[PDB]
Amino acid sequence: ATAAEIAALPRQKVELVDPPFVHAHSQVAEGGPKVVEFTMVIEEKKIVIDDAGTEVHAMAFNGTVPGPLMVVHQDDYLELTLINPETNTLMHNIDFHAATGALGGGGLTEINPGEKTILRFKATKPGVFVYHCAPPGMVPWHVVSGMNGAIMVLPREGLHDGKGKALTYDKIYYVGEQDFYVPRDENGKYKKYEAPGDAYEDTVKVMRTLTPTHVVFNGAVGALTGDKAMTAAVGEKVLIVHSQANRDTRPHLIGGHGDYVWATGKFNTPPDVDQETWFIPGGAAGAAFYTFQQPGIYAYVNHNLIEAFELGAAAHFKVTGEWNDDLMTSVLAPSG
Amino acid sequence: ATAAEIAALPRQKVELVDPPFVHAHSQVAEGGPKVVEFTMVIEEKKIVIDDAGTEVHAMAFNGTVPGPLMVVHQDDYLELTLINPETNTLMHNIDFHAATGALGGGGLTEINPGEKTILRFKATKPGVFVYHCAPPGMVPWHVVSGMNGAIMVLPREGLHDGKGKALTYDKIYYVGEQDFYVPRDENGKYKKYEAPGDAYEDTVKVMRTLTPTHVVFNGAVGALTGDKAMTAAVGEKVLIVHSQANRDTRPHLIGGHGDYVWATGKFNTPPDVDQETWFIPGGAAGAAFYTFQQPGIYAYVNHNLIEAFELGAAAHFKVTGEWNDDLMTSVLAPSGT
Amino acid sequence: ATAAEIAALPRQKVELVDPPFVHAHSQVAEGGPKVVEFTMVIEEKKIVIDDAGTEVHAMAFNGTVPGPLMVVHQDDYLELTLINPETNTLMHNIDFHAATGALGGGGLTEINPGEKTILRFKATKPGVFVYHCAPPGMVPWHVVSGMNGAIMVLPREGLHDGKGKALTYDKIYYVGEQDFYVPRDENGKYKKYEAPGDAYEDTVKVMRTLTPTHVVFNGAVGALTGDKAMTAAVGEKVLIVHSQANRDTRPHLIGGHGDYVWATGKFNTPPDVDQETWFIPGGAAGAAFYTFQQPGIYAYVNHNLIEAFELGAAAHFKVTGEWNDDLMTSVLAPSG
Ligand SMILES: [Cu+2]
Ligand SMILES: [Cu+2]
Ligand SMILES: [Cu+2]
Ligand SMILES: [Cu+]
Ligand SMILES: [Cu+]
Ligand SMILES: [Cu+]
DSSP: OOHHHHHTSOEEEOOOOOTTSOOOOOSBOOSSOOEEEEEEEEEEEEEEOSTTOOEEEEEEETTSSSOOOEEEETTOEEEEEEEEOTTOOSOBOOEETTSOSGGGGGGGOOBOTTEEEEEEEEOOSOEEEEEEOOOTTOHHHHHTTTOEEEEEEEOTBOEEOTTSOEEOOSEEEEEEEEEEOOOXOTTSOOOOOSSGGGGHHHHHHHHTTTOOSEEEETTBTTTTSGGGOEEEETTOEEEEEEEESSSOBOEEEETOOEEEEETTSBTTSOOEEEESSOOBOTTEEEEEEEEOOSOEEEEEEESSHHHHHTSSOEEEEEEESOOOTTTEEEEEEEEO | OOHHHHHTSOEEEOOOOOTTSOOOOXOBOOSSOOEEEEEEEEEEEEEEOSTTOOEEEEEEETTSSSOOOEEEETTOEEEEEEEEOTTOOSOBOOEETTSOSGGGGGGGOOBOTTEEEEEEEEOOSOEEEEEEOOOTTOHHHHHTTTOEEEEEEEOTBOEEOTTSOEEOOSEEEEEEEEEEOOOBOTTSOBOOOSSGGGGHHHHHHHHHTTOOSEEEETTBTTTTSGGGOEEEETTOEEEEEEEESSSOBOEEEETOOEEEEETTSBTTSOOEEEESSOOBOTTEEEEEEEEOOSOEEEEEEESSHHHHHTSSOEEEEEEESOOOTTTEEEEEEEEEO | OOHHHHHTSOEEEOOOOOTTSOOSOOSBOOSSOOEEEEEEEEEEEEEEOSTTOOEEEEEEETTSSSOOOEEEETTOEEEEEEEEOTTOOSOBOOEETTSOSGGGGGGGOOBOTTEEEEEEEEOOSOEEEEEEOOOTTOHHHHHTTTOEEEEEEEOTBOEEOTTSOEEOOSEEEEEEEEEEOOOBOTTSOBOOOSSGGGGHHHHHHHHTTTOOSEEEETTBTTTTSGGGOEEEETTOEEEEEEEESSSOBOEEEETOOEEEEETTSBTTSOOEEEESBOOBOTTEEEEEEEEOOSOEEEEEEESSHHHHHTSSOEEEEEEESOOOTTTEEEEEEEEO
């Protein structure tokens, strides 16, 4: 497309919402290619990541860890206005794994506090893709400070199975998984700091052990439980988008399955089926499609169970509906 | 199916066998859907996991690590009687990754010492699947104490490749891989404990390092070697089912390949072919089909070679038959330059 | 084939080239099956792997870490003369993952210093495959001392996509990734040793932590960056072969993609498409095909970004050509 052709395309301004929720969108594209406009303000802020009051100096796209999910369709243009307020201390940028050129956009979006930038890229490939900050010489530090999210580039005709049959979800959730490395004292108590830079040297030491102190969904242990448990009903079709910008994960829906899983996150790669546990490498997003068949509480985990149940990588689903005794029944309840 | 219809189905009681062997089963389903009945008694037991005499307080389905492989066909029902004897100290349950609902059955099978339960589920999806204990608040401790195994849900028409051609194995082995996290004293020597509970706090510390002290097949370093080495012959078709309930593995047959590998373990997902090293994520089972072409000793390993040869993740095959010089030959044996 | 038929096959000697470059070959097979002959001398030598003068006693096929890429076609034979000079102090051998029998050849190629051996095997399966030394009882020590490489067994009709359309590369690079486990003294300084064996006990202790001190491409931090960056042009089709003989990796082309990725490395397994980050398990090789669309500097990394940017697993591509504003443009450059 020429500069003139792009200029003539319709514009749509999207309002982003906080994960695990996803902004309003259509699965099948409405009309032809558009320039889809997003704005995110970067917030450097303290976050509390466990019930012991452990703190991380988060570097958060749109004020959240993970950053929000941006949804476009194949061959749309994604136009991001990225803002780094004067209240921040560090330079930031953005690398879209979905984008082609200039280190995913990182080379064109380096903004100091008090600066903003506008990047436009063509979403040529359908799938879920990681995005993250990557300042030269400071890359993993920003990423493991929570400065990452994902986008979804839907096929223009929506999702399909390996045989070309349409797959249409009722609900979509975005689970961003984060590896944290909290510094040791000598007593084994987590250290607190009053500036992000003050934590750098100590954090780098922990990072280099390749052993996270916490592995969490949505920025904290138990984040996606209770008041933030995800919800569904029996018969409901749900897409779970899962990202990890720095480290491998292995999602599993306890009590369920991944009926269709784009484990690589790319929609032109046929999905795996009937999955118990899928695998998403560090630096990637994946997506799982499931139709709920049983009511009750589900746990959604990274199935290294130490990571899930000692380090924090566990979410819940609360599912309504009728129990199916054909699928599962207690013939004899626990008894003497 | 209605309650009346399920009640009308044939019942078949199966006697389980110890890994790496698999009970008789057829491969192609014989007749219509059935309710296949299994019984397992849970044993909390001391096991020795290396030649030094390192002990683990194992929590063992059917008294073995891994628990035994249960084999059914798609749309059969698996009906498990699970028994927690009064001689045990902990509550246990079971999560079948193959099952749908109540945390894989875990929510319906919480049994205290002196209790039993019977769970029935419909095996709706074909493949190999992990099962493991998962008591709320104590999940990884039970799993990494060896309380896990796998099942196989065969398609009713047996196995096929990605293109609809039948794949019929001559024999099957189940390799359960276990990460252990054994506490050490100040001398760096593995600690021994009187009671399972005495080891909890020390073990959780090691678990949090995400670095196992031992990574083993069939419950111990060298368990599948010597007179316990797996066996095959040139021309023999072998299915190797491999599970890891907690941690990633990367199986490799040294001297061989995986001709067809269901790396995700699910038979409706077409298998990868001609594999050197496959990958099974923690919390899953996979399966590899191979026809042996050369005689001699093979090593079957987790191909992080530190895990294989330092931490214990190596098994052997003994293979009978005629050497094939077309496939491989020593043109010049090691000799002076 | 009969005994006379095998003996009647042409023999061809090939001159090897140091990684990341690859020796002369044709993508489509030229003529019928051949016995392709290679020679490699094993070198035990001290190498410097980082900017701080850190030493490894390398055990190097053909004197390089990784060993060179050998290229044949399906149903060719690979016939390797392996030489262990009397100046070396250890026994070595070779396990070809591409080969069938005798522990990949390891059982037939155990050569003491002052010995040589010739192994022939039929390359029955198409793909990229690891090779490595594997002396019984000291296997990981040799491998993590850099004694590993890869081969490529091309289909006789060259590469194809999942739909059977031909994929012809303009150039090929081989990136061997190495995990090193370098002992440190109590002050955190890396230790030096007189002879390879002197480091054995200390090195195994580090190995058992499963935490490399260094993760590098082409044998050293920054070996494929700066003036040693790999090169391409806009419109050029590049195959990147990547191997890791001992430990998982997750390759990512920053600013690009893997258009077609044989993540398992086997060409009869259909390639994944539109990949952001692919996954190669320890003990395997993979291959990614990409057509460059934007000029400039790219980074090519293991996308555990701590491994990439703290431990050394980062390479560069320098790409020439015209910038494509349709694919990506800075609408507003960083500004107040
Ligand atoms: Cu990235
Ligand atoms: Cu589980
Ligand atoms: Cu190997
Ligand atoms: Cu940043
Ligand atoms: Cu248990
Ligand atoms: Cu060697």
